[PDB]
Structure formats: C-alpha cells, structure tokens
Design a protein around this ligand. Structure first.
Ligand code: ADP
Ligand code: ADP
Ligand code: CA
Ligand code: CA
Ligand code: CA
Ligand code: MG
Ligand code: MG
Lengths: 375, 126, 160, 82, 74, 375, 82
C-alpha cells in the first residue's frame, strides 16, 4: 500500500467487535466488547493497576473484574464505555489515527434513532474522522454471499433480525426483528446447568458458560427423539474441564440450550421461533418473489454456527412451505465474519465512494444528517 | 581489553553524551527564540488616531484568538499522547516486571574495619 | 565483577605487596596456603559475620571461573576490592535514559557503530577496532549490531 | 598447664562449631538430592505425556485426510444428483 | 453526554479566554500598554507551542521505543 | 550514606523482633522479645542489678529471671512491656533516635483494632516519630518473593495466617487465620517430652525446649510409616546435651511435635491442618484464578523451616487438589526474614513514599486515622 | 597436665575429621545441585512440548468433528436425492 486512503470497516456488534481495513478477507482484530472495572481493594503499591481493562485484556484478568457489556440489544446503553471501546479499537488494536480514515459502522434494523445520531456525533466530534457511513447489518451479509436477492437471517449475539431483499430492492415492510440471540441462550444455559449441581453466578463465570455453549451445544434435528434418546442411553454425555479442574458432564442440556431458538417459549418469550419468523417474513412479501426468497435463504451471524442448524431450519421451513417450492439454505463456512466481509466489499466499491457523510455536510445539518438522503 | 579502560570509556561516553545534550538543548532554545521572534513582529503605532489604534486592538484580539485555539488544540493532543505513553509504560512494566526489584547491600562493612577486626592488636596502619 | 577489576586496576604494585603481607599475616600455617569460599565463610563466622552458604556460592561462583575455588593473584585483588562496594547507587536511570535518547541521532531506535566511532574519537583513548568489537560483544546481548536500550541499561547498570 | 587448658577449651569450641557446620551442609546435600529425585520423576512423566499426545495428533491427521477425501467424493455425487 | 460535556467544556474555556476588548475610551499610552501586554502574551504562547512541538517529537520517538520493546516482548 | 532520610523497618513479630534500616538485605538486630524481672532476693550490694532485662540480655541471665513474652497471639497483651521492648530496639540495638526516622510496623491480619490504634498512638506520642505506616505481614512476604500473585502461608511463632493475592488485588473474604503456631508446638513438645522422664516446667526451660525443637524436630513425609519405623528400629534416636550435661535422647518425639501443624487435633484444636486451610482458602477464591494460586503457593515465617515440610505440604495439597493442576510450593532459603526483606523493599519504593501517615494528619484525626485511607 | 595433653590431641583429631567431612559434604551438594538444575531445564522443555502437542491435538479433533458432520449431512441428502 501507499498513497491513497483506505477505509476503516468497523463493526460494533454486541459481544465481539470486529474491525479491519477495507479490502481484506478477515477482520484484523477481533476481541470481546467488555469493560471491567476492578472490584476488590488492591494492596500492592506501584503495580501499575489501571482503572478499566477493556477488550481482550479483561478476558485474562476476569477473575478480579466485573465485566459489563456496553451494548445490550443492538442499542447502546452506556455511551462512555462505548467511547472507551472505540478508542481502544482505533488506537491499540489497529494503531491508526482516525483523523485520516473513513469509517463504516454497522447498525441493526429498527433501532432507536438517538442511538444512531449519537454514534455519528461521537465519530465526528471526539475521534474527528473525515467521513462515516452507517449500514444495515443484513445488507452486508447479503453482499458477502455474492448474491443480489435472498432473505438473510442474521442471528447475532444481541438481536436476531430477518431482512428480505429482492433484486437489490429491500422490502421495509417485511423486516421481522426478534430480540432472542446468543446472550439469552447463554443465560438459559446457565440457568439449566443448575439442574445438575453446577452453579455459575458471577459475571465472570458467564464467560465460562459461554465457552461451554460454544464448544458443546448443538441443535437437534428432531427434538422429541433426542429427548427420548438422552433419557435412556448415555452416548451424549460429553465432559468439559473448568478453568480449575473438576470436570463437568453435560447431558441433555446439550441440545436444549440452542433449542430455545425454535421454541422461544422456553425463556418465556411469546414469539415464534426463527424457523417461523422467516416464513412469516417471506409471506409478507409479494406473491411473485416468494420462489426466489425460498431458494436463496441466507444464514449469517455468530449464533447460526451451531452444528446441525442448517438442516433443522430447512426441515422446518419445508414443513411450513408449499410442497412444490425448493427450499435451500445458504450456510457459508465463514458465517461469523460474513457481515464484516460484506462491509469490506461495500467499502471497496467505486460506485459507493460518493455516499459517505462528508464532515462539511454534518457541519451544515447537524447529527440529524444520517436520517437524510445519506442514509 | 582491560576493564579499567572500559570503565574510562564508559564515563567518557557519558560525559560526551551530556555535553552533546546540553549543546543541542541550548541550540534549540536559541533557534526557537529566533524563529518565534521572526514569527511575530513588534509594533510601533504611538500617537496615532484612536480609530486605527482600536482597529489594531481588534486585529490583535482576533490573532490571539486564532493562536490560542491552535495552541490549546496542540496542547490537548500532546496531553493525550502523554497519557497513552504513560499507559503503555505501565503496561510494559506489568508485562515483564516481577522479580526486577532493585537490591541494596549494607552488610558489606568497610574493608579497613574488617581487616582491623580480623587482626586486632598488631594492626596499626596495615 | 569486572568492575572491581577495573577499580583495582588503577592501583599499583604497592597494593600487591600490601596484600602479600596481609596473606602472610592471615594465611600463615595453612595447609593450602590459599583461601576458599568455605574458608572465607568459616573465617567470617569466627570474625563474627553469619551469612548464608547460598551467598557463599553466589560470591565464589562469580569469582571462581577456572573451578579452583581459589583467588588468582589478579582475581584475589579483584575480590579484596570487591568485598567493599564503593560504587553505589549507579547514577540516575532517568538521566541515562535521556542520554541514550540523545544517543540515537539517527532516531531509529537502534545504535549505529558510526556514533560509537565518533564518540570514541572524542574520547581519544588508545583503542583499536578490536577494542570496540570486544566491547560490543560484551554489550550486544542479542547480537543486533547495535546497543539496545535495555542492553544500554544493562551495560550501564550500577555504572556511576 | 592452666594456659594449655585454656587453649584446649578454645579448641573444643572450634570443634563444636565445625561439627555444627558439617551437619548443616550434610542436611542441605541430602535434601537437594531427594528433591532432584522428585524432579526427575516429574520430568519423566512429562516426556511420556508429550510423546503420547504427539502420536495422537499424527493419527488424527490421518483420520482428517481420509474423511476429507470422503467429503470430496460425496460433494461430487451431490452435484451430479443436483 | 460526556462527548457533549467535553465539547461544551472546550467552548466554555474558549469563551473564558475571550477577554472583553473595552479600551477605546482609554488613552494612547494605555492602549500601547495593553497592546504590549497582548504582544507578551502571544510571545509566551509561542514559546509554549514550541515546547509542545519538541515534547511531541520526543513523545513520538518514545512511542517508537515502546513499540520496539513490545516487539522484543514476543 | 549521608543526607537524606532512611526509614526504619521494624517488625514486632512474636518471639523475635527483627529491625533494620530500609534498603538492606538482612535485619540489623534480631533478638528475642522477652522482658524478665528478677525473682529472687539478691544479696550482693552495688552489683548494679537492674529491674528488667529485655531482649537478648535476658537470654543469658535467664537462670534467675521470669521471662514473659509481651505478645501472645499477634495481639499485644502488656503495653508497658511492649513499650520497653520498642525503646530498647530503637536506642540500644540500632542507636538511632526515632525523632528523625519513619517507621514501618507490621501486623497480622484480622487483629483487634484497639491494638493497631494503640500502636500508632504510642509511636506518635512517646517515641514521636515523623511518620509511621502499618502493613499486613503477608503482603510483605509476597514482595520478597518478587511475585505479584500467589497465596502466602505465613506460619509465624504467634499466629498462622494464609492471605491469597492475585495480580496485586488482595481477596479480603479468603483470609484464613489460625492461631496454631510455633509457641503451641513448643508447649506440645514440652508436654510429650514427659513421656520419657524429662520434665521442663520453669518459664526459663521453655527456651531449652524451644532449642530442642529447632535443632532436632523434622516433619515426616508420611506419618504412619514413620511411627511404625521409630517403634521397631532405633535409627531415629538423636541425642542432645542440656545446658548442664545429662544428654537426652529424643525418639519418635522428633516428628510428632511438628505433626501438630497438619493435625491440630493433637493439642485439642478443632480446625484442620495447614495443609487443608490452604486448600480451603484457595477454593473460596474465584474459579478463574485458582490455577495461578495453585502454581504459586508461597511459604514464609519461621515455623515453616522444619526440614521436610515443603514436600509434605505439596503431597497433601496434590492429594486434595484436582489431578490436572500443577502444585508448586515456593520455599526460599531466606524464609525466616522474608517478611522483613519485603518490608525493606516496600519502604524503599518511590511510589510508596506518599502513603506514610504524616504527623499533622494524626493531629487532625486522632489515632483512628489508621483505619482510614492511609491503611 | 597429662589430662590436658590427652584432651588437646583428641580435639585436634576430631577437628580435622570435622573439616574434611564438611568439605566432602560441600562437594556432594555442589554436584547434586548442578545435576538438579540440568534436570529442571529438561522438565521445562518436556512441559512446553506437551503443551504444544495438546494444543495441536485439540485443533485436529475440532477439524475432524466438523468434517464428519458435513459428511453425514451430505450422505443423507444424497440418499434423498436418489
Ligand atoms: N462456534 C460457535 N458455536 C456456537 N455459538 C457461537 C460460536 N461462535 C460464536 N457463538 C455465539 O455467537 C456470539 C457472537 O456473535 P457475533 O456474530 O460476534 O455477534 P455480533 O453480531 O455482535 O458480532 C457469541 O456470544 C456466542 O454466543
Ligand atoms: N530453624 C528452625 N527450625 C524450626 N523452627 C524454627 C527455626 N527457627 C525458628 N523456628 C520457630 O519459629 C519461631 C520464630 O518465628 P518468627 O518468624 O521469628 O516469628 P515472627 O513472625 O513473630 O517473627 C521460633 O519461636 C521457633 O519456634
Ligand atoms: Ca579461583
Ligand atoms: Ca542511532
Ligand atoms: Ca543487542
Ligand atoms: Mg452481527
Ligand atoms: Mg512474622
């Protein structure tokens, strides 16, 4: 590289911040988005103890911290912590001053306006970027698949949203946003582990339960048969070693944790599972583009990485859909970073180079410029 | 080479470095004074009509405004840089600190005292 | 350790004869006609100091290079001047940090041997390229061909 | 004779000190030897674990290659049927 | 908000520096005195700026040293 | 030395007072903390007989004195005697007036407040020091090892306490203080020696029993095997010469005296041994710092100098702990003075130079200043 | 005088015995300590090797599991396609 100017494709997310320069294949730095103040007193003098460890540093000292995510469900609830996370991302994980780089944030659909306006105001006043643009997290995941149609189910860690798109024309009346995501699955797993004796309570042990969920849980192809099998044999019980020994054995908690996605009544949510909100999102579309959406169903986001979900979802939709249509579920192996790869592709386009919100435009219309033509 | 020569070279290089540091610092001070004096020129407008006097007053007001804005922005940037420097310094100290505690020894008594104690009555000069 | 060699090196044959007479005074009648680390520990105990044998090992190993456990004439002088640590406090670390910052005129984070040459020419002491090579081998721990700042501290560690 | 007795007392004190020092050094030596025994046993166990894990890793590599070939074959079959 | 807090704080400091130019009613010698006071203030600010520049260059080199030692801490 | 001002690192302890100037390797003057009034009548006139011999002077005239320690279990029970001990320490063993030197006392964890407040009031009113600071005896022992984590078992002569520390953040809810220490072992040894015929009763003969314990006793690697071996062969019987002749032979009393540490039921104490209170202190800590505490177990204090304890303790903890974790026991050769070396290091730090309790601060808030921010 | 001479002679004999025993203990302790340090280095190398091998084995197991799942899915789909 050299002259010229590259764009910063940041992607706030909720659970893992993924960032990197535009035009690559994978994000340069991926690290949890947690800011944890120490909670004990501290007796050693001169140890160089800081007041807040952010990012991946607080996943190593988590034994004496109180980690707290600054993004609850897509929306940002603690602006100071989010500013700290952004500052860390720019200066220590990429080491590029923001004064010389455009930024491309990402935002979930149907989010509060004030969140987006505050985001752009921060990026323009504190970090003082040249130009920033905010994009919907599902269109990027559709970019990365190399398609131009299809209905994308982006089940992140904060919020699961399902944006249908045809021929490049998004259908704003058919977006079905559901707030069940990876975090609720972690909490439900932590709640059903107590049925064997293992109690995880501290906010640090939520990370251990998350690791258990990632490494062991899988989505059952048929729920009742698995419940019957796990209750008779013992071929499912997989063991796992805690960060201090005392291995634990997970029985039928393995496929009961991610089953909450298809039956949100487990955690008390009323709505229908991710297998039926996709069909409802399709049926709201026009009658002539339903075949294409059926054939190009796209999966993205981290939580769709459970082993065996691309078959359960296809079976469910085939049960719901008319018998003639072909149901195909696109599940690329690079699912987790699909949104960021799409973001890189979009930022690398020449046609897109004039859509950025230039700073002089913000100076003339204020932060409310984001809702205007420069979307 | 002999260790005495090496120690002499060490102290000589230290003195040379100190001399060069002081010389360059004084050079920087003199050049800074000259260049800054070049930047802002003294004025001479005594006895003029008060219209031009107040015009100059407003002009200098605005110039100070611009200069202060620039200088305060630079100061804020420098302070942020120093903050990052301190944070990185502490982080590096944490990463590879631990057993680097400096030590001092005082049990090493004065050699003449030790020889006197080991000798006793027959020790007057040696 | 070589620091005591340098310090005693300024002295002349008078100190050698003085320590010869001192050996006559102290080590007369010994079966070995020398002193060892165990011997030094026993004498210190008789003299009234009670150090740990680990310290005995630390001191003798820093001085017993040939494995004889003894004190060579030069090494005996170095040890006798070593017992008293006159050069304390090793100046100021921050001062040396600023000096080394001044050192990298190239401002590359590395020390060029050309600066070494200029500094030595400033010193003007009788030195060949071999002296500077030996000094670099002494200092350049990572063999980087420069003077690393941490290596700079080490070669100036305790050095007044 | 009295002065010789005093010298005898001094030699007795020296004997006491020498015996004490010899006992202390012997203690240090034997303790270090036993600790070395334990350390050698632990090092042996670490060698065994590392070698077994290396063998396991090689076998897993072979299984990976075979199952990868099977996956490629069934991919071709799937495309044909499509 | 904290970003708004800082932005308003900078603006408030800026206004704080903004002394009232109320001097027309004064006389020639006093006007000269005020002008020379401002000239001295500018001189001091320039000295501060140059010191900031030199310290920033030192900061840059120090951060270079820090990155180098970080590399040494593989 | 010269100008400037050095700090006095005193360390009251219970059994041996260790003091010396900050910045050295070993304490300058180490002497027992006993004050013994004469008990007989005294007929020689003009002999210059004092009314109380303190320190090491009363270990030479102990034949006609009644030695009594002024510190029972960490706490101080006889303030006049403790003041006398401090006065001796300052004026005769160091010969430095306290008007020109800061002091750094040490105190066991979980001690009564009144003890600490009275200590600071004495130091500020009677001796009139410039500034004094009180530190917990375990943090110093952790300083001396050059670590920054680890769980330190400081088995002194008065009280055995077990303070776990991680990354410089002490865990106040995991301190396990047990009152079995060297003095109780001396009393138990004096009580089991009576099984062979040797009766020691006088408070002066307690010193002789202490010397026997120091020179002969050792901790058995396996207790039952040693009890069986000592009951068949005679390879263990080591003899010892009293201060007047009449050598004595210690049989299986050798490893039964220090075994009380691992089985406090011998002296009737209910609690578990020092091998199990360390494991309990670890298990109270968080689940993510247990590996580091397992790997950095530190021993300190005088009573941990028994030959063969660093192996018995490791064997016991390895039996208790999970099989995967590595158990390592740090036993530096300078165990006895570890607390004082750490105290010297702490007093020599530049960052610590503003933590002293300055006299004007005491004048403004009274002796209760010690519990405040200046801890 | 006879008593004193006898005690002096026995003192000298015992003193020399003590000194030589102390020296032999020192030599043995030195040898054992050096061999102990060497064995410690060997143990550290064995431990790091074991860590490497276990990390590699974990990665291989993960890869094998993923490939096996993909194989099972493709097999079921091929049968249904026939
Ligand atoms: N391999 C995996 N298997 C199962 N769940 C995973 C896996 N990787 C990540 N997850 C879940 O997905 C979440 C990360 O989702 P991510 O896509 O990073 O969210 P975001 O959209 O905020 O970036 C984690 O919290 C975790 O619960
Ligand atoms: N070499 C030794 N072997 C066995 N026990 C010892 C040894 N040295 C000291 N002790 C015991 O330790 C006690 C001294 O402990 P110390 O650390 O001085 O306590 P404090 O914490 O009060 O300073 C003595 O009473 C003695 O019983
Ligand atoms: Ca020698
Ligand atoms: Ca250079
Ligand atoms: Ca080097
Ligand atoms: Mg996402
Ligand atoms: Mg103690």
């Amino acid at each position: 590289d050299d002259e010229e100017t590259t764009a910063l494709v940041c992607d706030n997310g909720s659970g893992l911040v993924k960032a990197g320069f535009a035009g690559d294949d994978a994000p340069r730095a991926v690290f949890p988005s947690i800011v944890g103040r120490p909670r004990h007193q501290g007796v050693m003098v001169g140890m160089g103890q800081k007041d807040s460890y952010v990012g991946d540093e607080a996943q190593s000292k988590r034994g004496i911290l109180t980690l707290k995510y600054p993004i609850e469900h897509g929306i940002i609830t603690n602006w100071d912590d989010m500013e700290k996370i952004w500052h860390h991302t720019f200066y220590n994980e990429l080491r590029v001053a923001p004064e010389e780089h455009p930024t491309l944030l990402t935002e979930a659909p149907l989010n509060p306006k004030a969140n987006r306006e505050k985001m752009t105001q921060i990026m323009f006043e504190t970090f003082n970027v040249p130009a920033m643009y905010v994009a919907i997290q599902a269109v990027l995941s559709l970019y990365a698949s190399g398609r131009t149609t299809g209905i994308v189910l982006d089940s992140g860690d904060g919020v699961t949203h399902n944006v249908p798109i045809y021929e490049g024309y998004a259908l704003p009346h058919a977006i079905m946003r559901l707030d069940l995501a990876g975090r609720d699955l972690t909490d439900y797993l932590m709640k059903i582990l107590t049925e064997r004796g293992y109690s995880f309570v501290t906010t640090a042990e939520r990370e251990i339960v998350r690791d258990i969920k990632e490494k062991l849980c899988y989505v059952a192809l048929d729920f009742e048969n698995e419940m019957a099998t796990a209750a008779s044999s013992s071929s499912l019980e997989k063991s796992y070693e805690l960060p201090d020994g005392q291995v634990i054995t997970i029985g039928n908690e393995r496929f009961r944790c991610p089953e909450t996605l298809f039956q949100p009544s487990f955690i008390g949510m009323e709505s229908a599972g991710i297998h039926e909100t996709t069909y409802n999102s399709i049926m709201k579309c026009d009658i002539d583009i339903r075949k294409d959406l059926y054939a190009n169903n796209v999966l993205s986001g981290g939580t769709t990485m459970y082993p065996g979900i691309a078959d359960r979802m296809q079976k469910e939709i085939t049960a719901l859909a008319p018998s003639t249509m072909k149901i195909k579920i696109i599940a690329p192996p690079e699912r987790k970073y699909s949104v960021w790869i799409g973001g890189s592709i979009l930022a690398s386009l020449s046609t897109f180079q004039q859509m950025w919100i230039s700073k002089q435009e913000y100076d003339e219309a204020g932060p409310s410029i984001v809702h205007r033509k420069c979307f | 080479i002999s260790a005495s020569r090496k120690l002499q070279l060490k102290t000589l290089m230290l003195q040379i470095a100190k001399q060069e540091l002081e010389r360059e610092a004084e050079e920087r001070r003199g050049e800074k004074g000259r260049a800054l004096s070049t930047r802002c020129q003294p004025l001479e407008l005594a006895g003029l009509s008060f219209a031009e006097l107040q015009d100059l007053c407003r002009q200098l007001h605005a110039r100070v405004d611009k200069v202060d804005e620039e200088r305060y922005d630079v100061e804020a940037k420098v302070t942020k840089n120093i903050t990052e420097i301190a944070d990185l310094n502490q982080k590096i100290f944490d990463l590879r600190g631990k057993f680097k505690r400096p030590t001092l020894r005082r049990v090493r008594i004065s050699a003449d005292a030790m020889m006197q104690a080991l000798l006793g009555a027959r020790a007057k000069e040696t | 350790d070589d620091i005591y060699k340098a310090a005693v090196e300024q002295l002349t044959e008078e100190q050698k004869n003085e320590f010869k007479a001192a050996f006559d005074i102290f080590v007369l009648g010994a079966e070995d006609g020398c002193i060892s680390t165990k011997e030094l520990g026993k004498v210190m105990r008789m003299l009234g100091q009670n150090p740990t044998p680990e310290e005995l090992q630390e001191m003798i190993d820093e001085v017993d290079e040939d494995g004889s456990g003894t004190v060579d004439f030069d090494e005996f002088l170095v040890m006798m001047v070593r017992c008293m640590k006159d050069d304390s406090k090793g100046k100021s670390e921050e001062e040396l940090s600023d000096l080394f910052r001044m050192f990298d005129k190239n401002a590359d984070g590395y020390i060029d041997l050309e600066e070494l040459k200029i500094m030595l020419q400033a010193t003007g002491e009788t030195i060949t390229e071999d002296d500077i090579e030996e000094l670099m081998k002494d200092g350049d721990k990572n063999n980087d061909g420069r003077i690393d700042y941490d290596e700079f501290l080490e070669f100036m560690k305790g050095v007044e | 004779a009295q002065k010789d007795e005093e010298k005898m007392e001094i030699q007795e004190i020296q004997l006491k000190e020498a015996k004490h020092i010899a006992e202390d050094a012997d203690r240090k030596y034997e303790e270090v030897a036993r600790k070395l025994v334990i350390i050698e046993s632990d090092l042996e166990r670490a060698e065994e674990r590392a070698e077994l894990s290396e063998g396991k890793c090689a076998e897993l590599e072979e299984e990976l290659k075979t199952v990868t070939n099977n996956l490629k074959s069934l991919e071709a079959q799937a495309e044909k049927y499509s | 908000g904290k970003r708004q807090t800082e932005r308003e704080k900078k603006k408030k400091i800026l206004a704080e520096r903004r002394k009232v130019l109320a001097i027309d009613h004064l006389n020639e010698d006093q006007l000269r005195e005020k002008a020379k006071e401002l000239w001295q203030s500018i001189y001091n600010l320039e000295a501060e700026k140059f010191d900031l520049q030199e310290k920033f260059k030192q900061q840059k080199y120090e951060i270079n040293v820090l990155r180098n030692r970080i590399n040494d801490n593989q």
